[PDB]
Amino acid sequence: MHCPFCRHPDSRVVDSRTTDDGTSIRRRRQCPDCSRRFTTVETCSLMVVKRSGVTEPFSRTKVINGVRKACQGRPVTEDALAQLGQRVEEAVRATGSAELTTHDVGLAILGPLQELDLVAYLRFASVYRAFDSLEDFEAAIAELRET
Amino acid sequence: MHCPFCRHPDSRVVDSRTTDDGTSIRRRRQCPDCSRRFTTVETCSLMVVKRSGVTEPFSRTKVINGVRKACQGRPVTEDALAQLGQRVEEAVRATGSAELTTHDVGLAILGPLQELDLVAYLRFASVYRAFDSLEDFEAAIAELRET
Amino acid sequence: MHCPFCRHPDSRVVDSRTTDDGTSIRRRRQCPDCSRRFTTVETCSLMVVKRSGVTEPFSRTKVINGVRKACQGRPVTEDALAQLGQRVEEAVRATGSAELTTHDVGLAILGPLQELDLVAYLRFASVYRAFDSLEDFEAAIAELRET
Amino acid sequence: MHCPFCRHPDSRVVDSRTTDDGTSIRRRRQCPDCSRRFTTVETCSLMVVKRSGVTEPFSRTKVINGVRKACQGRPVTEDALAQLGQRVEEAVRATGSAELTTHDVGLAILGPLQELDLVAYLRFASVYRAFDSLEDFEAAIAELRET
DNA sequence: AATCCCCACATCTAGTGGTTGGATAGCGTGAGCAGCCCACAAGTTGTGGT
DNA sequence: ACCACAACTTGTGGGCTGCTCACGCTATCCAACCACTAGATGTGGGGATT
Ligand SMILES: Nc1ncnc2c1ncn2[C@@H]1O[C@H](COP(=O)(O)OP(=O)(O)OP(=O)(O)O)[C@@H](O)[C@H]1O
Ligand SMILES: Nc1ncnc2c1ncn2[C@@H]1O[C@H](COP(=O)(O)OP(=O)(O)OP(=O)(O)O)[C@@H](O)[C@H]1O
Ligand SMILES: Nc1ncnc2c1ncn2[C@@H]1O[C@H](COP(=O)(O)OP(=O)(O)OP(=O)(O)O)[C@@H](O)[C@H]1O
Ligand SMILES: Nc1ncnc2c1ncn2[C@@H]1O[C@H](COP(=O)(O)OP(=O)(O)OP(=O)(O)O)[C@@H](O)[C@H]1O
Ligand SMILES: Nc1ncnc2c1ncn2[C@H]1C[C@H](O)[C@@H](COP(=O)(O)OP(=O)(O)OP(=O)(O)O)O1
Ligand SMILES: Nc1ncnc2c1ncn2[C@H]1C[C@H](O)[C@@H](COP(=O)(O)OP(=O)(O)OP(=O)(O)O)O1
Ligand SMILES: Nc1ncnc2c1ncn2[C@H]1C[C@H](O)[C@@H](COP(=O)(O)OP(=O)(O)OP(=O)(O)O)O1
Ligand SMILES: Nc1ncnc2c1ncn2[C@H]1C[C@H](O)[C@@H](COP(=O)(O)OP(=O)(O)OP(=O)(O)O)O1
Ligand SMILES: [Zn+2]
Ligand SMILES: [Zn+2]
Ligand SMILES: [Zn+2]
Ligand SMILES: [Zn+2]
């Protein structure tokens, strides 16, 4: 890990203190040339297993794209979509699991989206839940209306 | 057919083919005086006036793309989409108008859409009619129910 | 040219009256089956010859894209860009030439764009005229300021 | 390093490589208890806070793309762009901050930009500083002149 | 303006040949991960400091 | 609450073989454009309403 301050190769570890609550080792490293210290944290990569079966890293671009398609025409600014993507990623990482299932990403998305825009929420659910008849539409308006 | 280059009084057609659908015939006409050869397209008048008022030519690739998005995940193969594009283009040509507002190209889609797929119909309406809320999703479910 | 009303092949020409001022033959055609008449106009395809040397059909998408990149961040709605593209195409076709040179499309664009947005105009000219030093920037502000 | 799956107290590293630039080391750690193998990435903290406030990780592909657009048509090859990306990334890492607002990533580009190319500098400023009018194009030409 | 009757004929279709360019599969040659290996370089209790 | 320093040994990191995925190459197929010939057929005069 080249030193950030002087770009000299092979820095040397000083401390390697694993933290418990977070599963993140915190190693302080120091450079041989400049004699300075940089803190480095190591955290497990988030990944989502798809409906197909294979696994891929979590991207907020895909969350924001999916929400943006549903919000088409509605007064939702790009700032709100970015904030929603951030909230979804935070909620996903709060569980701490390394591998999550697209289905939970969807249940995490459907929380903030419902407060963001109702029509967007139903237009998102109609593709997420794979509606087939009209009956599902007023069924969903039922659950939304109950609140 | 005056030559566009030398403004010659008349010109001659080397090669003619009915190139698009049956809608247009494309000719290669050369000018005897200057021996330069130009291409030309003959077709019936069909110009969609957009929401802004900008007069833009009619294209099936833009009336299908707005339907492919609506029927997301539904068993509506590409053949059905091409068939619906054909049907809507024929329906809008048959009325014999040279200036068809784009507000009346949606109504030409809501007809065949109910037959094509019944949930995709509502999904197309949500963006086309800009449903402000869940209450309008219900009413559209109601009026459709009456048929 | 399949008849629009009944889609029967090989319609038959009735009149072929070339018009002078426009270089557009107007042929009225009639169908053998339905016995109805459709008017068809034939006009030379607009084409632009590029700086490379080859020729390509005129597209308003490319005009609007070029103007949109320059207008980035400025308060110019997409409606104004569509109207500007329409005006540019109208001005280009007013000359009546079949082949135009990208350079004139640029001089046609720089007319409406200057009234649309000054900063957009200079950011467009800086790429169109291929500026090399700062001196060009206040040189151009000179000509703009003279009006 | 607790296993994310079975919450085992400790785990072991099968394979380690310094994968990105010198910035990160990526390890493949397996759990002896459950024999499942997870990947992990270690790197220094660097998080750009965007204009909205959304904390997004630092990427050179987004600091070069905003410069490639500015130097449109100028003789600034891809090697120079990569070199400038390296220089700006190093300059922002060397300050040793874990939260660098994106308003201060532009200032880290305006430095090397003057050396790289002098018209591209002004073009980057027009969008970055949102010049409302031609008068501000002049002032920036003036302040640059003083250097 | 737009459209609508003739009639006769010059000419436009269209129906074959050639090219030529651009997709387009099937190849070959890269890229990655895994499974080894050991010792040196990293973790791991101790005492601390601010 | 990091941050520092101690020894030290267990551990990780690098270094080393294979493998599978992918992706960059090319000889072939269809499409488009040009050259060509005759005859339906599209034009180009001629009136004539709306
Ligand atoms: N890589 C990803 N990172 C984060 N969110 C993702 C990712 N891929 C998909 N998502 C989101 O999670 C949800 C997944 O729901 P969906 O029904 O589309 O499942 P899927 O596994 O993506 O389906 P498909 O079988 O088409 O891959 C969507 O809201 C989608 O935007
Ligand atoms: N140029 C076009 N050709 C054919 N259909 C079009 C064209 N433009 C729009 N449509 C169709 O017209 C319908 C009306 O929808 P829409 O409001 O999107 O029209 P629009 O002209 O694109 O206006 P807007 O600028 O508001 O999007 C849609 O189904 C759309 O596919
Ligand atoms: N096909 C096109 N139809 C209409 N406008 C076009 C077309 N191609 C380019 N233009 C526009 O005309 C102008 C051409 O100016 P420019 O200096 O870019 O020349 P160019 O011939 O496009 O250059 P290049 O050598 O990159 O092809 C631009 O405003 C561009 O948007
Ligand atoms: N995630 C990022 N990583 C690195 N540089 C970034 C990132 N986001 C923006 N920048 C850079 O920050 C500078 C500031 O410009 P800019 O206003 O576009 O920032 P921004 O975060 O994209 O905000 P905005 O939402 O207003 O576009 C630009 O030069 C841009 O390339
Ligand atoms: N046309 C649409 N209108 C509204 N919401 C939509 C639309 N299409 C998709 N969505 C929503 C519901 C889906 O669960 C979510 C993401 O679906 P999708 O478009 O398949 O992208 P994705 O992230 O799954 O891509 P990929 O399958 O390539 O990984 O977006
Ligand atoms: N994701 C979607 N889900 C449901 N319906 C949709 C979706 N996207 C488009 N539609 C419907 C409603 C819209 O009025 C119609 C076409 O919209 P739009 O994309 O604006 O038209 P367009 O592509 O023909 O024109 P333009 O590109 O000029 O906007 O299709
Ligand atoms: N970054 C930019 N900022 C402002 N105006 C720009 C920018 N890039 C290009 N332009 C303007 C000036 C150019 O004359 C015009 C079109 O240029 P360009 O981007 O080359 O597209 P184009 O239409 O020439 O594409 P093509 O070369 O593929 O045909 O747009
Ligand atoms: N066409 C252009 N001409 C001149 N300068 C430009 C152009 N496009 C971008 N820039 C400059 C000014 C902008 O502040 C900067 C980057 O802008 P931008 O594209 O918003 O950033 P980005 O791609 O890093 O982030 P984001 O995608 O989140 O908006 O580059
Ligand atoms: Zn160093
Ligand atoms: Zn001529
Ligand atoms: Zn007919
Ligand atoms: Zn485990």
Numbering used by the authors:
A (entry chain B), B (entry chain A), C (entry chain D), D (entry chain C): 1 to 147
Lines from the paper:
The structure of dATP/ATP-loaded NrdR in complex with the nrdRJ promoter (3.3 Å resolution) reveals an NrdR tetramer bound to the dsDNA. The relative orientations of the dimeric Zn-ribbon domains and the ATP-cone domains differ between this tetramer and the ATP-loaded tetramers that build up the dodecamer. The binding of NrdR to DNA is mediated by a pair of Zn-ribbon domains interacting with the phosphate backbones at each NrdR box via six arginines from each domain, including the highly conserved RRRR motifs. The short distance between the DNA-binding regions of the two Zn-ribbons, in each Zn-ribbon pair, is the main cause of the compression of the minor groove. The DNA kink leads to strongly distorted base-pairing compared to canonical B-form DNA and to several exposed bases that interact with NrdR. Two amino acids that appear to provide DNA sequence specificity are D15 and R17 on each Zn-ribbon, which form an intricate network with the exposed bases in the palindromic NrdR boxes, where the GC base pairs at positions 9 and 18 in box 1, and 40 and 49 in box 2 are highly conserved. As the dATP/ATP-loaded NrdR tetramer contains two DNA-binding sites 80 Å apart, it is suited to bind to two NrdR boxes located approximately three dsDNA helix turns from each other, also contributing to the specificity. The structure of DNA-bound NrdR suggests that this tetrameric repressor prevents transcription of RNR both by directly blocking access to the promoter region as well as restricting access for RNA polymerase in the sharp 180° turn of the DNA. Our results clearly support the assumptions from the cryo-EM structure of DNA-bound NrdR that conserved residues D15 and R17 are important for the specific binding of NrdR to the nrdRJ promoter sequence. The dATP/ATP-loaded NrdR will then bind to RNR promoters and restrict transcription of the RNR genes.
